Symmetry: none
Subunit: 121 residues, 2 copies
Amino acid sequence: SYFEPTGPYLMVNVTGVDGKGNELLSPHYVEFPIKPGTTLTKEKIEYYVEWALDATAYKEFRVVELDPSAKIEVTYYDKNKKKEETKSFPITEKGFVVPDLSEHIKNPGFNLITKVVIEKK
Amino acid sequence: SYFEPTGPYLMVNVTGVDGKGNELLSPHYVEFPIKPGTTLTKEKIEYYVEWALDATAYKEFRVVELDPSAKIEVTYYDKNKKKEETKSFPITEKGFVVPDLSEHIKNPGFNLITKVVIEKK
């Protein structure tokens, strides 16, 4: 989409490094629409980061491992409170259920900012 | 109905959380007409909260458990006394019989404000 998203979306910002910690790829903004009620697990996330790499020169690369302390975070202005609120979800196998924040924001961005070790297919 | 109800109705205001206490869904006003003399039990109530979720993005979710200390409450201005009165009904298996308060108010709202643990069908 050429315009801002109109619904919830996952925002992937990842730095790809090699097994030795040489950076190979800088964060590339890539968005994927997502719906509240969806369960996002570590494996789905690893696929989303792989899909994100296909929009770059490392399209033939696969994820070897994600920073295990990476989390999904969303920030928004709570209307009632006049406060900025932040919610963080850990990335585990069983995963978490995407909340519906439309009460405060129609198009929340769930951000994933992290490093991933990647390797050629 | 586009206009205020003309009779007794149950007002469901529920916050859906997951097994870990992550809020997923904010209270959504949903009303269901109800008649005095009707017996409202815990199971009927759990169905009403499930029906209430179908008017949201968690329509495919089912209730796992309601806050056991939740109660049904109705508030109204007693005409005679010039006093606000409040009656509270506990949510049990055998349930309670819906009173007729038309003497004081034609369209009392029986409110249910509570948290429910919900899960995908």
